[PDB]
Coordinates of C-alpha atoms and ligand atoms in Angstrom, one line a residue:
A1330 CA -6.1 32.0 -5.5
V1331 CA -3.2 32.6 -8.4
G1332 CA -1.9 29.2 -9.6
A1333 CA -1.0 26.9 -12.2
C1334 CA -3.1 24.7 -14.3
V1335 CA -3.0 20.9 -13.3
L1336 CA -3.4 19.9 -17.1
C1337 CA -1.3 22.3 -19.2
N1338 CA 0.5 24.3 -16.6
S1339 CA -0.9 27.7 -17.9
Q1340 CA -1.2 30.2 -15.1
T1341 CA -4.9 31.0 -14.1
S1342 CA -7.0 32.5 -11.5
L1343 CA -9.6 29.7 -12.2
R1344 CA -10.0 26.9 -9.7
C1345 CA -12.6 24.2 -10.2
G1346 CA -15.2 24.3 -7.1
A1347 CA -17.0 21.2 -7.7
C1348 CA -13.6 19.2 -7.5
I1349 CA -13.0 18.0 -4.0
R1350 CA -9.3 19.0 -4.4
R1351 CA -10.3 22.5 -6.1
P1352 CA -7.5 22.1 -9.0
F1353 CA -6.3 25.2 -10.9
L1354 CA -7.6 24.9 -14.4
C1355 CA -6.7 27.3 -17.2
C1356 CA -9.3 28.7 -19.6
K1357 CA -9.4 25.9 -22.3
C1358 CA -9.1 23.1 -19.7
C1359 CA -11.7 24.8 -17.2
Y1360 CA -14.1 25.0 -20.1
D1361 CA -13.6 21.3 -21.3
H1362 CA -14.1 20.2 -17.8
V1363 CA -17.3 22.2 -16.9
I1364 CA -18.9 21.4 -20.4
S1365 CA -18.6 17.6 -20.1
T1366 CA -19.1 17.0 -16.4
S1367 CA -21.7 17.8 -13.8
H1368 CA -18.9 20.4 -12.4
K1369 CA -20.2 23.6 -13.1
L1370 CA -18.9 25.8 -10.1
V1371 CA -15.9 27.9 -11.1
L1372 CA -13.8 29.7 -8.4
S1373 CA -11.4 32.6 -8.7
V1374 CA -10.8 35.7 -6.3
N1375 CA -14.6 35.7 -6.2
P1376 CA -16.7 32.7 -7.3
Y1377 CA -18.5 32.6 -10.4
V1378 CA -22.0 33.0 -9.1
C1379 CA -24.8 35.5 -10.0
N1380 CA -24.2 38.8 -8.3
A1381 CA -27.8 39.7 -8.5
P1382 CA -29.3 39.9 -4.8
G1383 CA -30.8 36.6 -3.6
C1384 CA -30.2 34.6 -6.9
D1385 CA -29.0 31.1 -6.8
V1386 CA -27.2 30.7 -10.3
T1387 CA -23.9 29.0 -9.9
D1388 CA -23.6 27.2 -13.1
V1389 CA -20.6 28.9 -15.3
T1390 CA -22.5 28.1 -18.5
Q1391 CA -25.6 30.1 -17.2
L1392 CA -23.4 33.1 -16.5
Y1393 CA -22.0 36.3 -18.0
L1394 CA -19.6 39.1 -17.3
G1395 CA -21.5 42.5 -16.7
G1396 CA -18.4 44.8 -17.0
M1397 CA -16.5 43.6 -13.9
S1398 CA -19.1 41.5 -12.2
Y1399 CA -21.1 38.1 -12.9
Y1400 CA -24.9 37.6 -13.5
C1401 CA -27.0 34.8 -15.0
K1402 CA -29.3 35.1 -18.3
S1403 CA -32.2 36.6 -16.1
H1404 CA -30.0 39.2 -14.6
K1405 CA -27.2 40.3 -16.9
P1406 CA -26.9 43.8 -18.3
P1407 CA -27.3 44.5 -22.1
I1408 CA -23.4 44.6 -22.5
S1409 CA -22.6 41.1 -21.0
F1410 CA -20.4 38.5 -22.6
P1411 CA -20.9 34.7 -21.4
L1412 CA -18.3 33.2 -19.2
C1413 CA -18.3 30.1 -21.7
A1414 CA -17.5 30.9 -25.2
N1415 CA -15.2 29.7 -28.0
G1416 CA -13.7 26.8 -25.8
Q1417 CA -12.7 29.0 -22.9
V1418 CA -14.0 30.1 -19.3
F1419 CA -13.4 33.9 -18.7
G1420 CA -10.5 34.6 -16.3
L1421 CA -6.8 35.8 -15.9
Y1422 CA -4.1 35.0 -18.3
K1423 CA -6.3 34.1 -21.1
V1424 CA -8.8 16.3 -20.4
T1425 CA -11.2 13.1 -20.7
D1426 CA -9.0 11.5 -18.2
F1427 CA -9.0 14.5 -15.8
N1428 CA -12.9 14.3 -16.0
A1429 CA -13.1 10.8 -15.1
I1430 CA -10.5 11.1 -12.2
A1431 CA -12.5 14.4 -10.9
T1432 CA -15.8 12.7 -10.9
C1433 CA -15.2 9.0 -10.1
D1434 CA -16.3 7.6 -6.6
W1435 CA -13.1 5.2 -6.6
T1436 CA -15.1 1.9 -6.1
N1437 CA -14.3 0.7 -9.6
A1438 CA -10.8 -0.7 -10.7
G1439 CA -11.0 1.1 -13.9
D1440 CA -10.6 4.2 -11.9
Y1441 CA -7.2 3.0 -10.4
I1442 CA -6.2 2.0 -14.1
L1443 CA -6.8 5.5 -15.2
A1444 CA -5.0 7.0 -12.3
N1445 CA -1.8 5.1 -13.2
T1446 CA -1.9 5.4 -17.1
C1447 CA -2.6 9.2 -16.9
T1448 CA -0.1 12.0 -17.3
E1449 CA 2.4 12.5 -14.2
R1450 CA 0.5 15.8 -12.8
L1451 CA -2.8 13.6 -13.3
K1452 CA -1.3 10.8 -11.1
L1453 CA -0.9 13.3 -8.3
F1454 CA -4.3 14.9 -8.9
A1455 CA -5.9 11.3 -8.8
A1456 CA -3.8 10.5 -5.6
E1457 CA -4.8 13.4 -3.4
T1458 CA -8.6 13.1 -4.9
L1459 CA -8.6 9.3 -3.8
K1460 CA -6.9 9.9 -0.6
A1461 CA -9.4 12.8 0.2
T1462 CA -12.4 10.4 -0.9
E1463 CA -10.7 7.6 1.4
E1464 CA -10.7 9.9 4.4
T1465 CA -14.2 11.6 3.9
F1466 CA -15.6 8.0 3.6
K1467 CA -14.3 7.3 7.2
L1468 CA -17.1 9.8 8.4
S1469 CA -19.9 7.5 7.0
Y1470 CA -19.2 5.0 9.7
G1471 CA -20.6 4.5 13.2
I1472 CA -19.0 5.4 16.6
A1473 CA -18.2 2.3 19.0
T1474 CA -18.9 3.0 22.8
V1475 CA -17.5 0.6 25.6
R1476 CA -20.6 -0.8 27.2
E1477 CA -18.6 -3.5 29.6
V1478 CA -14.9 -4.5 30.3
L1479 CA -14.6 -8.3 30.7
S1480 CA -10.8 -8.6 31.2
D1481 CA -7.3 -7.1 30.1
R1482 CA -7.8 -8.5 26.6
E1483 CA -11.6 -8.7 26.0
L1484 CA -14.7 -6.3 25.8
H1485 CA -18.3 -5.8 24.6
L1486 CA -19.0 -2.9 22.2
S1487 CA -22.1 -0.8 21.5
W1488 CA -22.5 0.8 18.0
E1489 CA -24.2 3.8 16.6
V1490 CA -27.5 3.3 14.9
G1491 CA -28.2 4.4 11.4
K1492 CA -24.6 4.4 10.5
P1493 CA -22.9 1.4 8.9
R1494 CA -20.2 -0.6 11.2
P1495 CA -16.7 -0.7 9.7
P1496 CA -15.2 -4.2 9.0
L1497 CA -13.7 -5.7 12.2
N1498 CA -9.9 -6.6 11.5
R1499 CA -6.4 -5.3 12.3
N1500 CA -6.3 -3.3 9.1
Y1501 CA -8.8 -0.8 10.5
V1502 CA -6.8 1.1 13.2
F1503 CA -9.3 3.3 15.3
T1504 CA -8.7 6.2 17.6
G1505 CA -9.8 5.8 21.1
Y1506 CA -11.2 8.7 23.3
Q1507 CA -7.3 10.6 23.5
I1508 CA -6.8 7.3 25.1
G1509 CA -4.9 5.9 22.2
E1510 CA -5.1 4.1 19.0
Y1511 CA -7.3 0.8 19.4
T1512 CA -7.8 -2.4 16.9
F1513 CA -10.4 -5.1 17.1
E1514 CA -10.8 -9.0 16.4
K1515 CA -13.7 -11.3 17.0
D1516 CA -20.7 -11.8 21.4
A1517 CA -17.1 -11.5 23.1
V1518 CA -14.7 -9.4 21.1
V1519 CA -10.9 -8.9 21.7
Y1520 CA -9.7 -5.2 22.3
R1521 CA -6.2 -4.1 21.4
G1522 CA -4.9 -0.9 22.6
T1523 CA -1.6 0.7 21.3
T1524 CA -1.3 2.5 24.4
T1525 CA -1.8 0.7 27.8
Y1526 CA -5.0 1.8 29.5
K1527 CA -7.4 0.2 31.8
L1528 CA -10.7 0.2 29.6
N1529 CA -13.3 2.7 30.6
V1530 CA -17.2 2.2 30.1
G1531 CA -18.7 5.2 28.5
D1532 CA -15.4 6.1 26.5
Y1533 CA -15.8 5.8 22.8
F1534 CA -13.7 5.0 19.7
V1535 CA -13.5 7.2 16.4
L1536 CA -11.7 6.6 13.0
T1537 CA -8.3 8.4 12.3
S1538 CA -9.5 10.4 9.7
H1539 CA -6.2 12.4 8.9
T1540 CA -5.9 15.5 6.6
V1541 CA -4.8 14.9 2.9
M1542 CA -2.0 17.2 2.1
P1543 CA -1.3 18.3 -1.5
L1544 CA 1.0 16.4 -3.5
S1545 CA 3.9 18.7 -5.4
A1546 CA 6.6 16.1 -6.1
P1547 CA 6.1 13.5 -8.9
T1548 CA 5.6 9.6 -8.2
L1549 CA 9.0 9.1 -10.0
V1550 CA 11.6 11.8 -10.8
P1551 CA 12.6 12.3 -14.4
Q1552 CA 15.0 9.4 -15.2
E1553 CA 18.6 10.1 -15.6
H1554 CA 21.0 7.8 -17.2
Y1555 CA 24.8 8.4 -16.5
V1556 CA 28.2 7.2 -18.3
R1557 CA 29.8 6.6 -14.8
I1558 CA 28.7 6.2 -11.1
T1559 CA 27.7 9.6 -10.0
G1560 CA 28.3 11.1 -6.3
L1561 CA 28.9 7.5 -5.0
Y1562 CA 32.4 6.1 -4.2
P1563 CA 32.5 2.1 -4.5
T1564 CA 34.8 -0.1 -2.8
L1565 CA 37.3 -2.7 -4.3
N1566 CA 37.4 -4.8 -1.2
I1567 CA 33.6 -5.7 -1.5
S1568 CA 32.8 -8.7 0.7
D1569 CA 32.3 -11.9 -1.3
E1570 CA 28.8 -12.1 0.6
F1571 CA 27.6 -9.0 -1.7
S1572 CA 29.7 -9.8 -4.8
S1573 CA 26.7 -11.3 -6.8
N1574 CA 25.0 -7.6 -6.6
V1575 CA 28.2 -5.6 -7.6
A1576 CA 26.9 -5.4 -11.2
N1577 CA 23.4 -4.3 -9.8
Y1578 CA 24.9 -1.6 -7.4
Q1579 CA 27.0 -0.2 -10.3
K1580 CA 23.7 0.1 -12.3
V1581 CA 22.3 1.9 -9.1
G1582 CA 25.1 4.5 -9.4
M1583 CA 24.6 5.0 -13.0
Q1584 CA 20.8 5.8 -13.0
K1585 CA 18.9 8.5 -11.1
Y1586 CA 16.4 5.8 -10.1
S1587 CA 16.4 2.0 -10.3
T1588 CA 13.9 -0.8 -10.0
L1589 CA 14.6 -4.2 -8.2
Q1590 CA 12.1 -7.1 -8.5
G1591 CA 12.8 -9.4 -5.9
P1592 CA 10.7 -12.6 -5.6
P1593 CA 10.4 -14.0 -2.1
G1594 CA 13.8 -15.1 -0.5
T1595 CA 15.9 -13.9 -3.5
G1596 CA 17.7 -11.4 -1.3
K1597 CA 16.2 -8.1 -1.3
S1598 CA 17.1 -6.8 2.2
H1599 CA 20.7 -8.2 1.7
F1600 CA 20.8 -6.2 -1.6
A1601 CA 19.5 -3.1 0.2
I1602 CA 22.0 -3.4 3.3
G1603 CA 24.7 -4.5 0.6
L1604 CA 24.4 -1.3 -1.3
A1605 CA 25.7 0.5 2.1
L1606 CA 28.7 -1.7 2.2
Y1607 CA 29.4 -1.1 -1.7
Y1608 CA 29.1 2.7 -1.2
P1609 CA 30.6 3.0 2.1
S1610 CA 30.6 6.8 2.6
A1611 CA 27.1 7.4 1.1
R1612 CA 24.4 8.5 3.4
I1613 CA 21.4 6.0 3.0
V1614 CA 17.8 6.7 3.9
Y1615 CA 16.0 3.4 4.1
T1616 CA 12.2 3.8 3.8
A1617 CA 9.0 1.7 3.4
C1618 CA 5.3 2.1 4.1
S1619 CA 5.2 -0.2 7.1
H1620 CA 7.0 -0.3 10.4
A1621 CA 7.3 -4.0 9.9
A1622 CA 9.1 -3.5 6.5
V1623 CA 11.4 -0.7 8.0
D1624 CA 12.1 -3.1 11.0
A1625 CA 13.2 -6.0 8.7
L1626 CA 15.7 -3.4 7.0
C1627 CA 17.0 -2.5 10.5
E1628 CA 17.3 -6.2 11.4
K1629 CA 19.6 -6.7 8.2
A1630 CA 21.5 -3.5 9.0
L1631 CA 22.2 -4.6 12.6
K1632 CA 24.2 -7.5 11.2
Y1633 CA 26.2 -5.7 8.6
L1634 CA 26.4 -2.0 9.3
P1635 CA 27.9 -0.1 12.2
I1636 CA 25.0 0.4 14.8
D1637 CA 26.5 3.9 15.9
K1638 CA 25.9 5.2 12.2
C1639 CA 22.3 3.9 12.3
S1640 CA 18.9 5.5 13.7
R1641 CA 15.5 4.3 13.6
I1642 CA 13.0 7.5 13.2
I1643 CA 9.9 6.9 15.3
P1644 CA 7.2 9.3 15.0
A1645 CA 6.0 11.1 18.2
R1646 CA 2.5 9.4 18.0
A1647 CA 4.2 5.9 18.6
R1648 CA 1.4 3.8 17.3
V1649 CA 2.9 0.1 17.7
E1650 CA 6.1 -1.4 19.0
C1651 CA 9.1 -1.1 16.5
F1652 CA 13.0 -1.7 16.3
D1653 CA 14.5 -0.7 19.6
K1654 CA 18.4 -1.1 19.0
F1655 CA 19.4 2.0 17.1
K1656 CA 19.6 5.6 18.5
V1657 CA 16.2 6.9 18.0
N1658 CA 15.2 10.2 16.1
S1659 CA 18.9 11.0 15.2
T1660 CA 18.0 12.3 11.8
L1661 CA 21.4 13.1 10.6
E1662 CA 23.1 9.5 11.2
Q1663 CA 24.7 8.0 8.0
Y1664 CA 21.8 5.4 8.0
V1665 CA 18.2 6.5 8.7
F1666 CA 15.5 3.7 8.9
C1667 CA 12.0 5.4 8.8
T1668 CA 8.4 4.9 7.4
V1669 CA 7.1 7.1 4.7
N1670 CA 4.5 9.1 7.0
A1671 CA 7.4 9.9 9.6
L1672 CA 10.0 11.0 7.0
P1673 CA 11.8 14.2 7.9
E1674 CA 12.7 16.9 5.2
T1675 CA 16.3 15.8 4.4
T1676 CA 18.7 14.8 1.5
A1677 CA 20.6 11.5 0.9
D1678 CA 23.3 10.2 -1.5
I1679 CA 20.9 6.9 -1.8
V1680 CA 17.3 6.4 -0.9
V1681 CA 16.1 2.8 -0.6
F1682 CA 12.2 2.4 -0.8
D1683 CA 11.5 -1.3 0.0
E1684 CA 8.1 -3.3 -0.3
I1685 CA 7.3 -1.2 -3.5
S1686 CA 4.0 -3.3 -4.3
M1687 CA 2.6 -1.9 -1.0
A1688 CA 3.2 1.7 -2.0
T1689 CA 0.5 3.9 -3.4
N1690 CA 1.4 6.9 -5.8
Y1691 CA 0.6 9.2 -2.8
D1692 CA 3.5 7.3 -0.9
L1693 CA 5.7 7.5 -4.0
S1694 CA 5.2 11.4 -4.4
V1695 CA 5.7 12.0 -0.4
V1696 CA 9.1 10.4 -0.5
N1697 CA 10.1 12.7 -3.6
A1698 CA 9.0 15.7 -1.5
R1699 CA 10.7 14.9 1.8
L1700 CA 13.8 13.4 0.4
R1701 CA 16.0 14.8 -2.3
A1702 CA 18.5 12.2 -3.3
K1703 CA 21.2 11.5 -5.7
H1704 CA 20.0 8.0 -6.3
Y1705 CA 16.6 6.2 -5.6
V1706 CA 16.3 2.5 -5.4
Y1707 CA 12.8 0.9 -5.4
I1708 CA 12.7 -2.7 -4.2
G1709 CA 9.8 -5.0 -4.1
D1710 CA 7.7 -7.4 -6.2
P1711 CA 4.5 -6.7 -8.2
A1712 CA 3.8 -10.5 -7.8
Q1713 CA 3.3 -9.8 -4.2
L1714 CA 0.4 -7.9 -2.3
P1715 CA -0.5 -4.2 -2.9
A1716 CA -1.8 -1.7 -0.4
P1717 CA -5.4 -2.3 0.4
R1718 CA -7.8 0.1 -1.4
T1719 CA -10.6 0.4 1.1
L1720 CA -12.9 2.1 -1.5
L1721 CA -12.5 -0.4 -4.4
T1722 CA -15.3 -2.9 -4.3
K1723 CA -15.8 -3.7 -7.9
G1724 CA -13.2 -5.3 -10.3
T1725 CA -9.7 -6.3 -9.6
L1726 CA -6.6 -4.4 -9.3
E1727 CA -3.9 -5.8 -11.5
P1728 CA -0.2 -5.2 -10.7
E1729 CA 0.8 -2.9 -13.4
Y1730 CA -1.8 -0.6 -11.9
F1731 CA -0.4 -0.9 -8.1
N1732 CA 1.6 2.3 -8.5
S1733 CA 4.1 3.9 -11.1
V1734 CA 7.2 1.7 -10.0
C1735 CA 5.0 -1.5 -10.5
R1736 CA 3.7 -0.1 -13.7
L1737 CA 7.3 0.1 -15.0
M1738 CA 8.3 -3.4 -13.6
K1739 CA 5.3 -5.1 -15.3
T1740 CA 5.5 -3.1 -18.9
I1741 CA 9.2 -2.4 -19.6
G1742 CA 10.5 -4.9 -16.9
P1743 CA 12.5 -4.3 -13.8
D1744 CA 16.2 -2.8 -14.1
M1745 CA 17.4 -5.8 -11.8
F1746 CA 15.8 -9.1 -11.1
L1747 CA 17.1 -11.5 -8.2
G1748 CA 16.3 -14.8 -9.9
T1749 CA 17.1 -17.3 -7.3
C1750 CA 14.9 -18.1 -4.3
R1751 CA 17.1 -19.3 -1.4
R1752 CA 13.9 -19.7 1.3
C1753 CA 11.6 -22.1 0.0
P1754 CA 11.8 -25.9 -0.7
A1755 CA 11.7 -26.3 -4.6
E1756 CA 8.0 -27.6 -4.8
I1757 CA 7.0 -24.0 -3.7
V1758 CA 9.6 -22.3 -5.8
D1759 CA 8.5 -24.3 -9.1
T1760 CA 4.8 -23.6 -8.4
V1761 CA 5.0 -19.6 -8.0
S1762 CA 7.8 -19.7 -10.7
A1763 CA 5.2 -21.0 -13.3
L1764 CA 2.2 -19.1 -11.6
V1765 CA 3.7 -15.4 -11.4
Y1766 CA 7.2 -15.4 -12.6
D1767 CA 6.9 -16.7 -16.2
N1768 CA 9.4 -19.7 -15.1
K1769 CA 12.3 -17.2 -14.3
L1770 CA 12.4 -17.9 -10.8
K1771 CA 15.0 -20.7 -9.7
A1772 CA 15.2 -22.8 -6.7
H1773 CA 18.5 -23.0 -4.5
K1774 CA 16.9 -25.4 -2.1
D1775 CA 16.0 -29.1 -3.1
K1776 CA 12.6 -30.2 -2.9
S1777 CA 11.8 -30.8 0.9
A1778 CA 9.1 -33.7 0.3
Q1779 CA 7.3 -31.6 3.2
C1780 CA 4.9 -29.8 0.9
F1781 CA 1.4 -31.2 1.0
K1782 CA -1.9 -30.1 -0.7
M1783 CA -5.4 -31.4 0.2
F1784 CA -8.4 -30.7 -1.9
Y1785 CA -11.2 -30.0 0.7
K1786 CA -14.0 -27.5 0.2
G1787 CA -15.5 -28.1 3.8
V1788 CA -18.2 -25.6 4.9
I1789 CA -18.1 -21.8 4.5
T1790 CA -19.6 -19.8 7.3
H1791 CA -19.3 -16.0 7.8
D1792 CA -18.6 -13.5 10.5
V1793 CA -20.4 -10.6 8.9
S1794 CA -18.3 -11.2 5.6
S1795 CA -14.8 -12.5 7.0
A1796 CA -15.2 -16.2 6.2
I1797 CA -14.5 -19.3 8.4
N1798 CA -14.2 -23.0 7.4
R1799 CA -14.3 -25.2 10.5
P1800 CA -14.1 -28.3 8.6
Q1801 CA -10.9 -27.1 6.9
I1802 CA -9.5 -26.4 10.4
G1803 CA -10.7 -29.9 11.5
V1804 CA -8.4 -31.5 8.8
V1805 CA -5.7 -29.5 10.0
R1806 CA -6.1 -30.8 13.5
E1807 CA -6.3 -34.5 12.1
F1808 CA -3.2 -33.8 10.3
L1809 CA -1.2 -32.4 13.3
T1810 CA -2.0 -35.6 15.7
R1811 CA -0.3 -37.5 12.8
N1812 CA 2.5 -35.0 12.0
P1813 CA 3.4 -33.6 15.5
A1814 CA 6.7 -31.9 13.9
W1815 CA 4.1 -29.6 12.4
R1816 CA 3.4 -28.3 16.2
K1817 CA 5.8 -25.5 15.5
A1818 CA 3.8 -24.3 12.3
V1819 CA 2.2 -20.9 11.5
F1820 CA -1.3 -21.0 10.5
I1821 CA -2.2 -18.8 7.6
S1822 CA -5.3 -18.0 5.9
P1823 CA -6.8 -15.1 3.9
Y1824 CA -9.4 -14.4 6.5
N1825 CA -9.1 -12.9 10.1
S1826 CA -12.0 -14.9 11.3
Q1827 CA -10.6 -18.2 10.0
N1828 CA -7.2 -17.2 11.9
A1829 CA -9.3 -16.6 15.1
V1830 CA -11.2 -19.9 15.1
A1831 CA -7.9 -21.8 14.1
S1832 CA -6.0 -20.1 17.0
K1833 CA -8.4 -21.4 19.6
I1834 CA -8.9 -24.8 17.9
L1835 CA -5.2 -25.6 16.8
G1836 CA -3.3 -23.3 19.3
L1837 CA -0.7 -22.3 16.5
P1838 CA 0.1 -18.8 15.9
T1839 CA -1.8 -17.1 13.2
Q1840 CA -1.3 -14.8 10.4
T1841 CA -3.5 -13.5 7.5
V1842 CA -1.6 -13.7 4.1
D1843 CA -1.5 -9.9 4.0
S1844 CA 0.2 -9.8 7.4
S1845 CA 2.6 -12.7 6.5
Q1846 CA 4.2 -10.6 3.6
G1847 CA 7.9 -10.1 4.2
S1848 CA 8.0 -12.9 7.0
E1849 CA 9.4 -16.6 6.8
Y1850 CA 8.6 -19.4 9.0
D1851 CA 9.8 -23.2 8.9
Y1852 CA 6.4 -24.6 8.6
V1853 CA 3.2 -23.0 7.3
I1854 CA -0.3 -24.4 7.4
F1855 CA -2.6 -22.6 4.8
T1856 CA -6.4 -23.1 4.7
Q1857 CA -7.8 -21.2 1.6
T1858 CA -11.1 -21.1 3.5
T1859 CA -13.3 -20.0 0.3
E1860 CA -13.2 -19.8 -3.3
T1861 CA -13.7 -16.0 -3.6
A1862 CA -11.6 -13.7 -5.9
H1863 CA -9.7 -12.6 -2.7
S1864 CA -8.7 -16.3 -1.5
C1865 CA -7.9 -17.1 -5.3
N1866 CA -5.8 -13.7 -6.0
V1867 CA -2.6 -15.2 -7.5
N1868 CA -0.5 -12.4 -5.7
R1869 CA -2.1 -13.5 -2.3
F1870 CA -1.4 -17.2 -3.1
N1871 CA 2.1 -16.5 -4.1
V1872 CA 2.8 -14.5 -0.7
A1873 CA 0.9 -17.4 1.1
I1874 CA 2.9 -20.4 -0.2
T1875 CA 6.2 -18.4 -0.3
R1876 CA 6.4 -17.9 3.7
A1877 CA 7.8 -21.6 4.4
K1878 CA 11.2 -22.3 4.6
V1879 CA 10.7 -26.2 5.2
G1880 CA 7.5 -27.5 4.7
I1881 CA 3.7 -26.3 3.9
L1882 CA 0.2 -28.0 4.1
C1883 CA -2.3 -26.4 1.9
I1884 CA -6.0 -27.3 2.4
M1885 CA -7.6 -25.8 -0.7
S1886 CA -10.9 -24.8 -2.0
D1887 CA -10.0 -23.8 -5.7
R1888 CA -9.4 -26.7 -8.1
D1889 CA -7.3 -24.4 -10.4
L1890 CA -4.9 -23.3 -7.6
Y1891 CA -5.0 -26.8 -6.0
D1892 CA -3.9 -28.4 -9.4
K1893 CA -1.0 -25.8 -10.0
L1894 CA 0.4 -26.7 -6.5
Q1895 CA 3.5 -29.1 -7.2
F1896 CA 3.0 -30.8 -3.8
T1897 CA 2.2 -34.2 -2.8
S1898 CA -1.4 -34.7 -2.3
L1899 CA -2.9 -36.0 1.1
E1900 CA -6.2 -38.0 1.4
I1901 CA -9.4 -38.0 3.5
Ligands
ZN2338 ZN1 -4.9 24.0 -18.7
ZN2339 ZN1 -14.3 19.7 -11.1
ZN2340 ZN1 -29.2 35.7 -11.4

């Protein structure tokens, strides 16, 4: 009940009651909040409510101090002072953007813009508020009960009447009932249990609505620039393999934190693992939001770093399968690879946070609270995909608003930029270079002459809202018969339901653009499926076409993106 003001830090007994996160607001700030918002409940040791029996006056503007107690205009004694006067709310120890964060529903992009352009304490207030809103919205959905079990990989579900049905995709990870987390993909649906259990009729599934903890640490610590490398001890026998990053690894030791923008295949994990070879005695904690991102850092470390000094931290609630070669849960090993939510409370010489476009400010703050490091390195690319914002339905979230790190990379530029793409045929590198990298990304590979584009709108059908284009898949089938080398291609599309249809018709492994991020394949077959803002998103398009090492086939719906593709056009 006695704390610090979330806007000006002045100590106060006042907490805003109408705020879902109940922030401490000082006398000047509590007033400016209650007089310009629907928020009128003020909390202290005792709430600011009328003390007269059976009275329901809770608005702080309609209340007064009757000596030591509180009363409305109808119950106050003659010697009563209003709680709201001269720009203050009465309390102990006697903002436009705070109001908007406190009262928004988080469905508009302008809400997220504000949550990243505001002061540092308001970024934390915005991040807990948003995460709390996102969790309380999980309750709004209806329960799914197993009505019948067809086989080991297929079932038929029964939904709650009156409550909406959450969108069916691998993004929504449910909690079965405690029979394990379960995921669903499309009247016969496919059931995916993270824990092997013989599907029971009658058992139900409910969302993993986890409690939102308060944020204490900033999203970014205050920046420190040094005259020499601090607390880190460099090598001189630094492997030629990593010689290109020597000036960048020194930049890492002469700053508290540093940002690395690495377009696809420019050497991000090679840079991250190479930083351990450059500072060979340094204890490095490698973190990222996803298990796949942490596993990709584990794979690179398995090749360059000693396996006995490595440890893959796995949370006791082992959700899905991850890296199995390091000693598990040995928190004290020199190299610790761990997802953000599983991080222990520890210190490090360097903390490497990879896939930074996928971090929220909540993730940025959590990392600063569990890890106290001499140096922090944020690696990623604001031209790649951000973390999905389940509440956001109106407006588009631009890269400078993904998180604090992305905001910096897009405004003042990144500290370091990996300028040479070594993965993709030059047709792809030149296309994304002009599209999202202002012509600063260079191709190492030659043009493969295996990058094709076809302008074919097809027919758009829908599985609730996830889209399907059977004619675009038919064009891919006609292409495969004529180009059998493409039999080893990964089918990619912006929609789960397009992927499910293509898996049955084509037999190729499938992946959504969002799940393909960080992965690479020799051949990629992309079908745009629709002309929505989702399928036309330049960051999603960039990720989609930069998955290919050798060739790509793009069946496009949008004239704009089709025209921007520096690929050989196919006919029919
Ligand atoms: Zn204040
Ligand atoms: Zn409030
Ligand atoms: Zn009253």
